Design an enzyme around this catalytic site. Sequence first.
Site, short mmCIF file in Angstrom:
data_model
loop_
_atom_site.label_atom_id
_atom_site.label_comp_id
_atom_site.label_asym_id
_atom_site.label_seq_id
_atom_site.Cartn_x
_atom_site.Cartn_y
_atom_site.Cartn_z
N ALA B 99 13.53 50.18 -4.19
CA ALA B 99 12.48 50.38 -3.16
C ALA B 99 11.42 51.38 -3.62
O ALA B 99 10.58 51.83 -2.75
CB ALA B 99 13.12 50.84 -1.87
N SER B 140 20.75 59.09 1.50
CA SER B 140 19.68 60.11 1.41
C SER B 140 18.63 59.78 2.45
O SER B 140 18.40 58.58 2.69
CB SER B 140 19.03 60.17 0.05
OG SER B 140 18.43 58.92 -0.29
N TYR B 224 24.53 66.31 -9.99
CA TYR B 224 24.97 65.49 -8.83
C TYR B 224 26.50 65.48 -8.78
O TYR B 224 27.04 65.47 -7.66
CB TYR B 224 24.37 64.09 -8.91
CG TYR B 224 22.92 64.01 -8.51
CD1 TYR B 224 22.40 64.81 -7.50
CD2 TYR B 224 22.07 63.12 -9.15
CE1 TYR B 224 21.06 64.74 -7.15
CE2 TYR B 224 20.73 63.03 -8.79
CZ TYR B 224 20.23 63.83 -7.79
OH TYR B 224 18.92 63.73 -7.42
N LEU B 252 36.31 58.25 16.39
CA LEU B 252 34.86 58.50 16.25
C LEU B 252 34.22 58.89 17.60
O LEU B 252 33.29 59.68 17.58
CB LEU B 252 34.21 57.25 15.67
CG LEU B 252 34.64 56.90 14.25
CD1 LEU B 252 33.99 55.60 13.81
CD2 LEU B 252 34.32 58.04 13.29
N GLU B 254 35.41 60.76 19.80
CA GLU B 254 35.75 62.18 20.10
C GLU B 254 34.74 63.11 19.42
O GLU B 254 34.42 64.16 20.04
CB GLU B 254 37.20 62.47 19.72
CG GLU B 254 37.75 63.71 20.41
CD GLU B 254 39.20 63.98 20.08
OE1 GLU B 254 39.94 62.99 19.80
OE2 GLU B 254 39.59 65.17 20.08
N1 GTP Z 1 23.47 65.30 -3.10
C1 GTP Z 1 22.97 64.25 -3.77
N2 GTP Z 1 21.68 63.92 -3.60
C2 GTP Z 1 21.34 62.84 -4.35
C3 GTP Z 1 22.12 62.10 -5.21
N3 GTP Z 1 21.38 61.08 -5.80
C4 GTP Z 1 20.18 61.22 -5.28
N4 GTP Z 1 20.10 62.26 -4.39
C5 GTP Z 1 18.94 62.74 -3.65
O1 GTP Z 1 18.42 61.65 -2.92
C6 GTP Z 1 16.97 61.68 -2.96
C7 GTP Z 1 16.51 60.44 -3.69
O2 GTP Z 1 17.11 59.30 -3.04
P1 GTP Z 1 18.08 58.26 -3.77
O3 GTP Z 1 19.36 58.13 -3.01
O4 GTP Z 1 18.13 58.50 -5.24
O5 GTP Z 1 17.23 56.91 -3.53
P2 GTP Z 1 17.75 55.44 -3.24
O6 GTP Z 1 18.30 55.42 -1.86
O7 GTP Z 1 18.61 55.01 -4.40
O8 GTP Z 1 16.37 54.65 -3.15
P3 GTP Z 1 15.30 53.98 -4.18
O9 GTP Z 1 15.72 54.29 -5.59
O10 GTP Z 1 14.05 54.71 -3.69
O11 GTP Z 1 15.28 52.50 -3.89
C8 GTP Z 1 16.60 63.04 -3.59
O12 GTP Z 1 16.44 64.05 -2.60
C9 GTP Z 1 17.80 63.29 -4.51
O13 GTP Z 1 17.96 64.66 -4.83
C10 GTP Z 1 23.48 62.46 -5.39
O14 GTP Z 1 24.31 61.93 -6.13
N5 GTP Z 1 23.82 63.58 -4.62
#
Ligand code: GTP
Lengths: 56, 437, 350, 428
Positions: B99, B140, B224, B252, B254
Amino acid sequence: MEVIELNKCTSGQSFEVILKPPSFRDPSLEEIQKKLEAAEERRKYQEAELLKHLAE
Amino acid sequence: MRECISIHVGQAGVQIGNACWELYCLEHGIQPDGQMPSDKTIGGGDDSFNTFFSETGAGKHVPRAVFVDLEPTVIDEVRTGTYRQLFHPEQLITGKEDAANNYARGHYTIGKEIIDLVLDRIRKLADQCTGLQGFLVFHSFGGGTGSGFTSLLMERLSVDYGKKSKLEFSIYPAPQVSTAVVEPYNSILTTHTTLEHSDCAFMVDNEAIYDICRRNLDIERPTYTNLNRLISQIVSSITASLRFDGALNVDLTEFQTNLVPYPRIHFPLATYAPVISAEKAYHEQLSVAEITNACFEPANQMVKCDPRHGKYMACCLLYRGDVVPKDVNAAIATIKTKRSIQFVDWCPTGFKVGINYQPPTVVPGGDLAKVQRAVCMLSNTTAIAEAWARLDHKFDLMYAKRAFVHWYVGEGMEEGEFSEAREDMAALEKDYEEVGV
Amino acid sequence: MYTFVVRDENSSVYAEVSRLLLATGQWKRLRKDNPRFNLMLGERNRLPFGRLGHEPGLVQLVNYYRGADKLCRKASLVKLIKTSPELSESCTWFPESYVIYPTTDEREVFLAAYNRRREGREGNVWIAKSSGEGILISSEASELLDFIDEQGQVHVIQKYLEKPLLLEPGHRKFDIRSWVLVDHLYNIYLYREGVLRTSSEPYNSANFQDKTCHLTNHCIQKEYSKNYGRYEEGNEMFFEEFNQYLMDALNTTLENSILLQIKHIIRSCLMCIEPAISTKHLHYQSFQLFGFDFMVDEELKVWLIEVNGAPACAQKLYAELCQGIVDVAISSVFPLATSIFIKLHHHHHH
Amino acid sequence: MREIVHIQAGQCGNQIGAKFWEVISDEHGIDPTGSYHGDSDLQLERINVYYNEATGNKYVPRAILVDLEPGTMDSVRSGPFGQIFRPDNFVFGQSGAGNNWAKGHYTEGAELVDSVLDVVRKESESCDCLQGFQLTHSLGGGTGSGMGTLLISKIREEYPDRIMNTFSVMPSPKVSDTVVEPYNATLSVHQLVENTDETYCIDNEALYDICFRTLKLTTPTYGDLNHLVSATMSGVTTCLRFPGQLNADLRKLAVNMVPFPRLHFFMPGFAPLTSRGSQQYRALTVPELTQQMFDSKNMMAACDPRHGRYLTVAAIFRGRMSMKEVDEQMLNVQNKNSSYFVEWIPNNVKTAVCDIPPRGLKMSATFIGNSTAIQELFKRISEQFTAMFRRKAFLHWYTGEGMDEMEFTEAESNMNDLVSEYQQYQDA
Ligand SMILES: Nc1nc2c(ncn2[C@@H]2O[C@H](COP(=O)(O)OP(=O)(O)OP(=O)(O)O)[C@@H](O)[C@H]2O)c(=O)[nH]1
Ligand SMILES: Nc1ncnc2c1ncn2[C@@H]1O[C@H](COP(=O)(O)OP(=O)(O)CP(=O)(O)O)[C@@H](O)[C@H]1O
Ligand SMILES: Nc1nc2c(ncn2[C@@H]2O[C@H](COP(=O)(O)OP(=O)(O)O)[C@@H](O)[C@H]2O)c(=O)[nH]1
Ligand SMILES: COc1ccc2c(c1)NC(=O)CN2c1nc(Cl)nc2cccnc12
Ligand SMILES: [Ca+2]
Ligand SMILES: [Ca+2]
Ligand SMILES: [Ca+2]
Ligand SMILES: [Cl-]
Ligand SMILES: [Mg+2]
Ligand SMILES: [Mg+2]
């Protein structure tokens, strides 16, 4: 400081502790598919305006 | 017993999913092949862990889990990874193109092409369920998939399964590890569209987790893997009551009656102690008093904010390890006299306590040390609106110039959804301000 | 190069602090809404504390303590003193006070202690105030109880000190203003130079509505009071002169007669709210400058009137105090390439 | 989001395009035969972004070589890496374009464009998921400028949902084949502002000044200029070619870098600046990489970043160094110079890191800036255009191919509009 509904078992215990009492449209399948189709229409419009401009 | 289906959307949801299911397996003594020696009812049962695992004739324990990503790289790692045997191929759903950090592309464009498949693979698990409670949704705010597809999925789960409860585990965007500059846009759009479809949402600010890893694990530049193993510990604490014999937060529904009296104000603050480095040679073990007290340090919170300058509507303590009610009550009594713990005039000033006697399980060769007692505090405090204020401000700065808007309008979204999404958030900041001042 | 922003253009004190910071050539100033500051010299209303301490690679300091308004707004100060165990209702340095709303409220409890000072034959006169912008001092309070069941805000009804200490020559009134700096470590720093804001009109016990000999505000003494700048310029007596007077006229010192009681009330007030406002383990740091306003009575007993969260300094002192705010509150956190203050610390064992 | 289809058009497009494939084939362990003789595995994890896998486990660039004369393209076959390229991907006419945009876009170029689009289609059909296109061309000649922009237009028509990326070399009187370059460039920029998602502005003015003032070369050749180009091209494509914590594509780059669709002209920078052959042995420290990569003197577009504001920034650190030192220095630049970064795009600087350094350096930084200062490049070419256009000087070369004065007036106007828009966001 009252301790209440104490439930115990092999795995652990749970309870509630209280100090003071109180100081007293989820839309349809239809409406969604219209939002998603309306967006696709605007996307197909904008693509037609580009291919019209390129045809010029 | 009532089954719970976990849904992991986008990179953040999937990787955190791996971290949690790895931990769950270690906690329940399920092996990577899916075999559970301890389980003596072979081919089924209605034990507490069956909430999260179904069983096969061959005695294989399989997560009630759907992984969804619009791009295959991350779910391909699950498919070929240490837990490849554990999962049913049909539970791992990927597209070809993602996306591109764009809510509108994840929701409207690429969303539509895959929503019906995902809901079909979700319906296959719901049909293996005697009494589905509902769904745990991991994503996220920041990702185009995490934000945009998740909100489409949630709208539909409300339609197909209206009686069922929906919880979120939501990663709030932090510049220090974020990939994209439009995460504030994605965050607001998905909060707005998702708000009425979510009973209870646990937000984790990557900023809080990053600084806990730096400060308490002595890790220069947390990855990560570092953030995710810490997050998975906190998720395990929150979910332990669904997977273990107990009488607190058993289903859930609760979570909502205990933590969410006002349905919109459904963002409980998680605080977790203790976090101790595995490479720390000498560590003198922390008491019930010290770790309960640590639940009131902002530095231990999943979101940095100041509960002193807000009001509480609910506070649960979930202890793991050598804890007994007397120590908790002594600890709690000491803590009232020292700290500012103001509840809303219309709620009991009280705690709901849950103790599971099995101490936390740490992943072998992880960064987290074994401890004989840990706690996770779930407080619904107005102070968390600080996170909404920060995010809404970032959004107002960019949106004032219509910076990057054209990428969203180009995917079929109307400029109007931005100001609508931002109005809802203005309303949300106001609800919190009314309740808490 | 440390960075700061300025979000209160009308601040006498922080105008002068921004100036001293630039004049070091180690602090540049950013645009109001540039989020990449080390130091915020913040607005007075709705300071967005929730945006502080989330800028990676920047230690952030602000010149206000979130929650300090509990001490600095009339009605909350009265609730704080009446409800905090560490400053009991018996608290011997605060005038008996009641919070009263225009038609929660104390009005019923106000009349019980008030109608014992009819029976008592005690000089039962009060004052009512908001948070000379509409002040009234009535004997019985036919007027007061009604006066502001009329105007906007909530009000405090406060004991009036009938029997104040009398400066001579003049047979006149005063209030003392002390400047207290609380640094990020919750060090409490009393500035050695205070000021007596004086009345110039002899004090009158029978005519109360004459708000001139009774009200000591710098504003009021220029407009209504005609003997402005007669004895001292301008209705401002400093500490060398007041010490000298107390030595000449009463045989004590400022230190013994008054300042021990001021140091006690300051550390008593700020150590009460410390757990609510401290920034010790927070992701941003706070300091703040307070103005404490005291009344001395004729037996040389100091009483707390109000605490001011956004105080102005007196004209000659700006230079010295503002330099001190930098040395103690700012340079302690952001260091460059005879102390002005008395540190209020006490550890009595019991 | 896997495959990129590369196109190189005209003399400059093909000389720079060739040096790109040389430098990038050495970094991924590919020899001039297509045989992989590497040692790391980060080399082959995303080889498919730029290479097709052929019979014998051999790698062939997803590259199309376009010219209206055979000269330069027979020089590529002859050159070191000539044999790597798929021989069917060499598309050439015989007439040349005479440094004439009109011949490239409207007469000589139209005759050949359909042949190019056939080879583009043969590569695009073979693609699991096409991200889109990158084009190497000058804006100052006839083929790369006029035919290259005709291609871009046809490719958008046939692939309107794919990303268009250009490395566009801007002309300069300091390195000047002909007087008509400002004409060719202004006509091309009009096409670029309409029909590309992201354009690396590679300014022959900047490349000359770096060669003379910094690298101390008295008489800089196209070889000296093309050394700076090949280093930057390696630099800015790192996060497309190599696995890291950022696995970027041309779309994610566009979404994050371009806040307004017309403002997609990037100012690239490189540190440390090397003159080929003689490379010094003192490895650069992270503080030094950070200071240089943001210095005017390290910019490949002859603009002063201090005369504008940074809308967005992307920075690539290559080599073995402290992640923590990189975050510290990158935060020091922004917090120490915060006026030069728009307040209305929070967190507008993003940093990636790659363990594999380029050939000949232990450590390097590559800078990609969407600065409003790039207007200075566009004003320079506008002044050169107007100096001639006020007297319709040299126009007969264009009217002779069917063009009208009108079309020149329209292009002058779009480019001056582009400059007003950069100005608009410099005073926000
Ligand atoms: N805590 C944590 N945050 C993550 C991780 N991977 C990505 N993020 C966070 O998620 C955000 C980016 O979103 P992603 O989840 O990578 O995006 P996606 O949902 O795969 O979406 P697109 O690639 O845009 O299609 C940023 O704020 C990153 O720091 C992870 O393994 N752990
Ligand atoms: N209880 C009391 N007894 C005697 N005099 C009093 C009094 N309360 C107030 N005053 C008089 O009124 C003045 C202070 O009023 P108030 O405390 O409202 O100040 P203020 O907030 O309006 C200006 P500032 O913020 O500088 O104190 C004193 O100088 C004193 O003269
Ligand atoms: N940097 C660089 N610029 C070049 C090169 N060759 C030509 N130029 C510039 O490109 C322009 C001439 O275009 P050219 O590519 O020769 O014309 P074409 O073959 O018709 O596309 C002029 O501005 C030259 O200065 C080169 O190899 N490197
Ligand atoms: C300003 O914010 C950004 C700038 C550049 C980027 C991003 C954000 N996020 C992405 O996913 C793509 N991206 C990048 N894309 C590429 Cl090909 N290369 C890069 C090199 C360094 C930093 N970022 C990128
Ligand atoms: Ca079983
Ligand atoms: Ca619902
Ligand atoms: Ca011909
Ligand atoms: Cl249902
Ligand atoms: Mg993704
Ligand atoms: Mg040439």
